[PDB]
């Protein structure tokens, strides 16, 4: 029985008895106590559980950064992968990330349940493209639902990054 080793916000995780059936969302919320990442559907559709994943791409040099749905990612696929959650990019206790700060001051968050995933979708874009186009910004959120805002204020807060 081999050890599964990954990172969550820069911190090594050694899981000595990984269960194949454990999703990453379950593991963050209930083993690691990191509950900013939300459950909205458990099926890939809403984005509430959006995280960033990083890994060394052996075929391209490059560490690559991309977004995933924590609700569908088996932790057993994540050996030597680095996970970044909403609590890994900033906090009110320390310093907010610009993504977090903008969505909040722009009236992009009402109930707030979708806000962590939208933040991590936006954060991922910017890790790949620090000067996105307005187009790239809108397409960043294809996988993220919000029931509250009607979307205008979110996209508007974020065009400041373009």
């Amino acid at each position: 029985a081999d050890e599964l080793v990954f990172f969550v916000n820069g911190k090594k995780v050694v899981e000595k008895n990984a269960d194949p059936e454990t999703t990453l969302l379950a593991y963050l919320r209930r083993k690691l106590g990191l509950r900013g990442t939300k459950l909205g559907c458990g099926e890939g559709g809403c984005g509430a559980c959006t995280v960033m994943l990083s890994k060394y791409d052996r075929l391209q040099d490059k560490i690559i950064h991309f977004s995933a749905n924590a609700c569908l990612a088996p932790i057993c696929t994540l050996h030597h992968v680095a996970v970044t959650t909403v609590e890994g990019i900033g906090s009110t206790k320390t310093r907010l990330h610009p993504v977090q700060e903008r969505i909040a001051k722009s009236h992009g968050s009402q109930c707030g349940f979708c806000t962590p995933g939208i933040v991590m979708s936006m954060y991922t874009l910017l890790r790949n493209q620090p000067e996105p186009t307005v187009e790239e910004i809108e397409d960043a959120f294809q996988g993220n639902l919000c029931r509250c805002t009607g979307y205008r204020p979110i996209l508007q807060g974020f065009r400041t990054f373009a």
């Binding site: 029985a1 990984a18 269960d19 194949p20 458990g42 890939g44 052996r58 977004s67 609700c71």
Partner: protein, 305 residues
């Protein structure tokens, strides 16, 4: 990388480091589920209560992750993410001349309002194809284009073009039990070859009744006379199907209003839905199979002149 083995309450997961390992694992355990993105297996397990007691994850294997340019097209390993396929084809499309990228731009059109960045960054090419959902948006494009599939078991290797026979039954492919999908070559389009792909806005049932297609015509050189014609559809049966009776009739006919009429006659009849057909929208679905061909018909006349 060494092979890892995780063992749970009900499931054993082997993470294969090497192609050779996989083909041996799958020969010992032909039942074993390949998992790459889990964007399908996770849903089957959680919502359909499928237990698969053996999982191989072949995601580490280079070969399954290779992107190879070639004289006939661009090959992607089966474990490659749709985001990568998407990115590479966009570069192919910006770089190559319109007449070579007809099929590519069909893939991109299906990839456009497909899921979201999260799904595409993890969903594998090979997982879509072998999943064989009746409503797969890619498999109609792959079938209509004869996209070549390299299939390996331990000892054997073969490359087949995707055609109607690659999908015999519901949720089933024409890979033998010890076999895996290794790579997929999506072809350049030739001169006098035009391609379109379309999809239904609405989906409403879990794996049925969303109309989606790929449409390919090859003319005799410089001409408007049909040499080959493929029209393949998802969301009209329990699998991806080709309108084969209808398009056979048009070989050596010309691209005119009469062809338009005859293809609609053929499609209306050959893809006809019983009133009790799974998913309903019996009439909407029929209108779309014709309306999609008419958009293709008109696009192809624009390309001809």
């Amino acid at each position: 990388p060494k092979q890892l083995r995780f063992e749970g309450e009900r499931v054993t997961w082997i993470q294969a480091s090497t192609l050779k390992e996989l083909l041996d694992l799958k020969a010992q355990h032909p039942e074993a589920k390949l998992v790459v993105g889990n964007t399908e297996i996770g849903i089957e397990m959680k919502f359909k209560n499928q237990l698969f007691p053996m999982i191989i994850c072949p995601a580490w294997i280079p070969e399954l992750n290779a992107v190879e340019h070639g004289p006939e097209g661009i090959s992607f390993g089966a474990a490659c993410a749709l985001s990568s396929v998407e990115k590479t084809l966009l570069e192919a499309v910006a770089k190559l001349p319109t007449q070579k990228t007809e099929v590519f731009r069909g893939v991109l059109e299906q990839l456009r309002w497909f899921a979201g960045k999260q799904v595409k960054s993890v969903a594998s090419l090979g997982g879509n194809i072998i999943t064989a959902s009746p409503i797969s948006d890619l498999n109609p494009v792959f079938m209509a284009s004869g996209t070549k599939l390299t299939i390996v078991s331990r000892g054997t290797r073969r490359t087949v073009p995707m055609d109607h026979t690659f999908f015999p039954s519901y949720r089933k492919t024409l890979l033998g039990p010890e076999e895996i999908l290794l790579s997929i070559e999506i072809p350049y389009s030739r001169e006098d070859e035009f391609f379109s792909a379309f999809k239904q806005a609405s989906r409403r049932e879990d794996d049925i009744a969303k109309v989606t297609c790929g449409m390919r015509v090859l003319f005799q050189p410089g001409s408007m006379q049909v040499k080959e014609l493929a029209l393949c559809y998802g969301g009209m049966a329990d699998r991806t199907i080709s309108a084969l009776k209808t398009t056979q009739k048009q070989l050596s006919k010309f691209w005119n209003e009469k062809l338009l009429q005859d293809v609609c006659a053929g499609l209306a009849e050959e893809l006809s839905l019983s009133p009790d057909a799974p998913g309903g929208m019996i009439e909407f679905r029929r209108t779309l199979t014709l309306s999609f061909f008419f958009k293709f018909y008109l696009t192809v006349l624009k390309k001809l002149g």
